[PDB]
Design a protein around this motif. Sequence first.
Motif, mmCIF file in Angstrom:
data_model
loop_
_atom_site.group_PDB
_atom_site.id
_atom_site.type_symbol
_atom_site.label_atom_id
_atom_site.label_comp_id
_atom_site.label_asym_id
_atom_site.label_seq_id
_atom_site.Cartn_x
_atom_site.Cartn_y
_atom_site.Cartn_z
ATOM 1 N N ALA B 105 -1.913 2.077 9.145
ATOM 2 C CA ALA B 105 -1.782 2.582 7.779
ATOM 3 C C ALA B 105 -1.185 1.527 6.859
ATOM 4 N N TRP B 106 -0.216 0.765 7.364
ATOM 5 C CA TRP B 106 0.267 -0.394 6.632
ATOM 6 C C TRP B 106 -0.838 -1.430 6.466
ATOM 7 N N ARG B 107 -1.546 -1.742 7.553
ATOM 8 C CA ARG B 107 -2.592 -2.755 7.510
ATOM 9 C C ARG B 107 -3.678 -2.378 6.513
ATOM 10 N N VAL B 113 1.084 -6.252 -0.966
ATOM 11 C CA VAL B 113 0.955 -7.694 -0.796
ATOM 12 C C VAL B 113 1.642 -8.205 0.452
ATOM 13 N N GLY B 114 2.445 -7.366 1.115
ATOM 14 C CA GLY B 114 3.290 -7.850 2.177
ATOM 15 C C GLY B 114 2.725 -7.640 3.565
ATOM 16 N N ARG B 115 1.415 -7.395 3.660
ATOM 17 C CA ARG B 115 0.774 -6.956 4.900
ATOM 18 C C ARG B 115 0.605 -8.049 5.944
ATOM 19 N N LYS B 120 4.333 -6.403 12.921
ATOM 20 C CA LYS B 120 5.766 -6.394 13.202
ATOM 21 C C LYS B 120 6.354 -5.222 12.433
ATOM 22 N N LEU B 121 6.190 -4.037 13.017
ATOM 23 C CA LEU B 121 6.676 -2.791 12.435
ATOM 24 C C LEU B 121 7.406 -2.004 13.511
ATOM 25 N N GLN B 122 8.624 -1.585 13.212
ATOM 26 C CA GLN B 122 9.418 -0.815 14.161
ATOM 27 C C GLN B 122 9.231 0.655 13.829
ATOM 28 N N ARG B 153 14.385 -5.883 8.519
ATOM 29 C CA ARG B 153 13.366 -5.655 9.532
ATOM 30 C C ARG B 153 12.569 -4.439 9.101
ATOM 31 N N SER B 154 11.257 -4.489 9.305
ATOM 32 C CA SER B 154 10.365 -3.459 8.791
ATOM 33 C C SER B 154 10.418 -2.233 9.681
ATOM 34 N N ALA B 155 10.536 -1.052 9.072
ATOM 35 C CA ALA B 155 10.692 0.148 9.881
ATOM 36 C C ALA B 155 10.079 1.351 9.193
ATOM 37 N N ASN B 266 8.491 8.966 -0.270
ATOM 38 C CA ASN B 266 7.807 10.122 -0.827
ATOM 39 C C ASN B 266 6.315 10.132 -0.542
ATOM 40 N N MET B 267 5.833 9.282 0.352
ATOM 41 C CA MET B 267 4.398 9.220 0.582
ATOM 42 C C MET B 267 4.008 10.051 1.801
ATOM 43 N N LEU B 268 2.700 10.170 2.012
ATOM 44 C CA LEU B 268 2.167 10.958 3.112
ATOM 45 C C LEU B 268 1.388 10.049 4.047
ATOM 46 N N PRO B 280 9.491 7.965 5.730
ATOM 47 C CA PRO B 280 10.125 6.864 4.997
ATOM 48 C C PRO B 280 9.878 5.522 5.668
ATOM 49 N N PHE B 281 9.437 4.540 4.881
ATOM 50 C CA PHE B 281 9.133 3.234 5.429
ATOM 51 C C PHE B 281 9.805 2.179 4.569
ATOM 52 N N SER B 282 10.122 1.054 5.189
ATOM 53 C CA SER B 282 10.960 0.083 4.521
ATOM 54 C C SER B 282 10.548 -1.298 4.984
ATOM 55 N N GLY B 283 10.631 -2.249 4.063
ATOM 56 C CA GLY B 283 10.502 -3.654 4.383
ATOM 57 C C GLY B 283 11.596 -4.433 3.681
ATOM 58 N N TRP B 284 11.208 -5.433 2.899
ATOM 59 C CA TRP B 284 12.144 -6.133 2.036
ATOM 60 C C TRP B 284 11.460 -6.415 0.695
ATOM 61 N N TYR B 285 12.263 -6.778 -0.307
ATOM 62 C CA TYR B 285 11.784 -6.885 -1.684
ATOM 63 C C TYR B 285 11.041 -8.186 -1.950
ATOM 64 N N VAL B 374 -5.314 -5.031 -8.890
ATOM 65 C CA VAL B 374 -4.419 -4.552 -9.939
ATOM 66 C C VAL B 374 -2.977 -4.499 -9.449
ATOM 67 N N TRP B 375 -2.776 -4.140 -8.177
ATOM 68 C CA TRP B 375 -1.444 -4.037 -7.595
ATOM 69 C C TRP B 375 -1.011 -5.307 -6.865
ATOM 70 N N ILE B 376 -1.958 -6.087 -6.324
ATOM 71 C CA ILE B 376 -1.611 -7.296 -5.571
ATOM 72 C C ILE B 376 -1.110 -8.398 -6.505
ATOM 73 N N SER B 400 -3.774 5.979 6.887
ATOM 74 C CA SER B 400 -3.450 5.528 5.539
ATOM 75 C C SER B 400 -2.222 6.244 5.010
ATOM 76 N N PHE B 401 -1.593 5.601 4.036
ATOM 77 C CA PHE B 401 -0.555 6.203 3.210
ATOM 78 C C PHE B 401 -1.193 6.773 1.949
ATOM 79 N N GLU B 402 -0.934 8.045 1.679
ATOM 80 C CA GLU B 402 -1.471 8.746 0.524
ATOM 81 C C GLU B 402 -0.332 9.258 -0.345
ATOM 82 N N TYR B 403 -0.657 9.572 -1.589
ATOM 83 C CA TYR B 403 0.307 10.256 -2.421
ATOM 84 C C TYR B 403 0.252 11.747 -2.133
ATOM 85 N N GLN B 404 1.339 12.423 -2.472
ATOM 86 C CA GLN B 404 1.452 13.863 -2.331
ATOM 87 C C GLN B 404 2.254 14.396 -3.500
#
Lengths: 416, 414
Positions: B105-107, B113-115, B120-122, B153-155, B266-268, B280-285, B374-376, B400-404
């Motif tokens: 879903a990340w891929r 842009v950070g794919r 490397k996802l925990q 670390r990505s989680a 807040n995503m699905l 909830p998913f997290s990386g770095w800025y 547009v987002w990249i 995939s990650f979707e909005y809800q």
Amino acid sequence: CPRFLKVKNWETEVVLTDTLHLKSTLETGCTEYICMGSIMHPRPEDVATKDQLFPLAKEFIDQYYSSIKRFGSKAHMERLEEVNKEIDTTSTYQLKDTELIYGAKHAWRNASRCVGRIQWSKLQVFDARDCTTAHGMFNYICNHVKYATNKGNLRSAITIFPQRTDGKHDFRVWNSQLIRYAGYKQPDGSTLGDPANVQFTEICIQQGWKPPRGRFDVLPLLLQANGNDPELFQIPPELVLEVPIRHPKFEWFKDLGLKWYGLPAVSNMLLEIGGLEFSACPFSGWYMGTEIGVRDYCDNSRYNILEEVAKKMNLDMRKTSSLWKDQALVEINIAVLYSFQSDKVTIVDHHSATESFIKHMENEYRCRGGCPADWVWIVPPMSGSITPVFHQEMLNYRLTPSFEYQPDPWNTHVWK
Amino acid sequence: PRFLKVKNWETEVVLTDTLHLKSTLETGCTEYICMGSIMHPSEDVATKDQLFPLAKEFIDQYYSSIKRFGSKAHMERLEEVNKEIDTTSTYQLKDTELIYGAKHAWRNASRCVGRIQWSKLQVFDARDCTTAHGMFNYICNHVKYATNKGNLRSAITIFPQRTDGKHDFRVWNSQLIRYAGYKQPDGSTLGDPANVQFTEICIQQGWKPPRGRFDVLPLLLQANGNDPELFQIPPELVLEVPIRHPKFEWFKDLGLKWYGLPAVSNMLLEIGGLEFSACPFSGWYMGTEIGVRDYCDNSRYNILEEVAKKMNLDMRKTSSLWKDQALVEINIAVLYSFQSDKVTIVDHHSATESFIKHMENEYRCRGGCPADWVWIVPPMSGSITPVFHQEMLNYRLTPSFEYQPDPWNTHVWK
Ligand code: HEM
Ligand code: HEM
Ligand SMILES: CCO[C@@H]1C[C@H](CCc2cc(F)c(F)c(CCc3cc(C)cc(N)n3)c2)N(C)C1
Ligand SMILES: CCO[C@@H]1C[C@H](CCc2cc(F)c(F)c(CCc3cc(C)cc(N)n3)c2)N(C)C1
Ligand SMILES: C[C@H](O)[C@H](O)[C@H]1CNc2nc(N)[nH]c(=O)c2N1
Ligand SMILES: C[C@H](O)[C@H](O)[C@H]1CNc2nc(N)[nH]c(=O)c2N1
Ligand SMILES: [Zn+2]
């Protein structure tokens, strides 16, 4: 398909409703399962046929008589009748002067990639459908440049050459813009002048041009009329308004020796009006600063001066996180705007321009039911999210009359 | 139905895309109208009938990925999921499928842009959680692991899947760590304007706001469809960077700061027909997320005027580019600050460069890479990054990650 489409501005919460999309005619390249909005271009010897042309002319003539609040009139039905007869007996037809002017204004009004469209109604249209030779093309083009430049108070203009007929008699401006700088590839791989124009410069040189081989050599016009081989012509240098680039705070910036021409004039596009194809239709406006300051000057495959500018600003250039590129790009774009303004040459910064476009787009939704816009092009190449268009949802669709791309003439021309 | 090429107009590199032939979710575009700039282009509880193909398709690509398509395990895992959808109207993912699903879903995230880091996802499996306290516990373990004293670390943490729509797990915050926003009596806004509504929802729920400018919001956790509960993240888990500038020493006088961990909550997450409404998913800025959008949007902290003030710039005319000059300085300060505190951050030049490399990779080994230009493209300095001149095909691959919908529009209290 749905009859109402909503776009939202995520900065101001304004929601607009598009019905104009229902009148879109051409394909975008997108489907239900893939989007090609970041694709740049999603035989030219083939021309429209009788049965292809009848509805295209009728659609445009309907639209024209609707715009003048005469739809269904006697004049309208006689115009349809007249145009159907020409198509029947000649496989083509001629636009009235008023229709040619309306169609051109509307091609610009429909140009989804143009941020400057707030000005679309104020466009001087030069009718050059009586032209037969390349000298006459040159004459018409020199008048365009002189009128549009107007000593620095630039005015938008278009000159329209005869429409395509059988495809073997096209008029073309081989130049991509009426005024560009030459590019000379060196034996050692380096480039003098404008890298984007190397190929076209080699063509001019082959056709007989003697290049000064400098950093800012205005290219000659390469003009093709009625399907003949193109011909060279030197624009009178007093007709080419140029602006030397200096900086308000940095004394050394003039020492880079940079200058740019004042009049941006695209000359390689195709104007389609009611199924008629005008393969030579140079149009001109005035610059948004970033076109010069960001792209022409700072693109790697262009004049590529960020490095030299950053060196003179003594910026740490070893790491990217210092943002030395971004810092120099802003100063460069300040010097461009400062120079055009000091010399009283019309120019618009990206803030004012995007701000005008939002206002224009809202007016078009209100009065016209939509405004096609290509976000990938409308949003400026620097400082994007601090301009209002960045947060504006846009619908992109192709309305006719329109400006289109067309192949480069050297790739298709049959040499006499 | 063809191979499509994408061109980079700087390098003239052309890649050929076959991967799009495998997509089946819709983009929102048509042959006549392109919606590439619509943010959310256009009840959700699928039944057994819709569910088995989706599941069968996901197991197919799973066993295809581990070089065992059509094996005995594949045959049997299909019948196991068949029997399970059959009898219970849903099915449970194995641990391997769940990890594989979250990574892909990340891929597949066209807007990210950070794919280049995608695999490397925990993945923390929280599908045994039943209460908001359990949610709070799994979220604190997530925040502590991913922050990691600055070397982030990505989680992702994945709560139970939606069942009937009445028992949804939801994290009401849009990010695990955000600052609060306060409507003032005089009309202005203190703190972060994007969170004004959510902050009032928290106050209405009993939260005692410090009414400062950078107040960490409490977690609002909804478990199994019940009313959400409030929890305070232990402050020692919330890593923050005070923003100072390497040349302007007055910049610290601005009193600005940001948190280290971007964590979207807040995503699905959709995997093989299953809906994980809490993941909830997290990386770095990337520096610009803070320095351009958070600080310089009009609808956010809106600090540009203050900065260009102290830079003593000519702010009368727009054509002095005083906003643009102040924006670069703010974004130097963010990058300088994070790097000096050894908190992981990437600048928009290095990230877009990495994404181009990622794109080359994906075209080589996978046949494509869905990408939303547009987002990249970064929100400043666009065309001096490589992605600006990169053509991108956008298309919708699953998992995939979707909005809800926001939970406060849907939730029926009691
Ligand atoms: C009057 C001031 C004008 C401004 C400020 C302006 C601004 C712009 C800008 C910034 C672009 C993007 C160009 C690029 O990045 O390559 C553009 C594209 C375009 N403009 Fe305008 N323009 C103006 C006049 C005109 C006129 C007079 C016409 C036609 C009558 C026109 C039609 C177009 C078209 C067709 C494009 C797309 C070009 C392409 O696809 O390469 N513009 N304009
Ligand atoms: C590890 C470092 C990462 C970096 C530097 C990064 C960078 C970005 C950026 C700049 C955006 C645009 C965000 C915005 O403007 O709101 C984005 C979007 C996104 N990212 Fe990544 N990201 C990272 C990790 C991740 C991870 C770990 C996941 C999932 C497990 C992820 C999934 C997404 C998704 C789904 C979006 C779309 C957001 C939306 O549509 O609102 N990213 N990323
Ligand atoms: C190849 C490397 O970069 C290239 C450079 C170019 C940068 C943008 C650009 C630079 C120019 F000099 C120019 F004349 C135009 C013309 C567009 C135009 C037309 C009218 C009527 C008015 C107006 N204001 N602008 C655009 N971009 C296409 C990619
Ligand atoms: C309404 C208009 O303004 C808003 C402002 C906002 C600015 C962008 C932004 C700012 C953040 F602080 C943030 F956390 C995220 C999260 C995205 C993210 C996720 C992951 C996993 C890693 C990572 N590095 N980033 C995005 N943008 C969406 C539009
Ligand atoms: C209207 C437009 O879709 C919207 O403002 C988008 C534009 N591009 C973006 N790009 C990123 N990375 N993040 C965003 O929030 C947005 N917002
Ligand atoms: C890859 C992408 O389609 C291409 O670089 C586009 C991006 N947006 C642009 N926008 C403008 N105004 N002019 C351009 O040449 C481009 N180039
Ligand atoms: Zn599209």
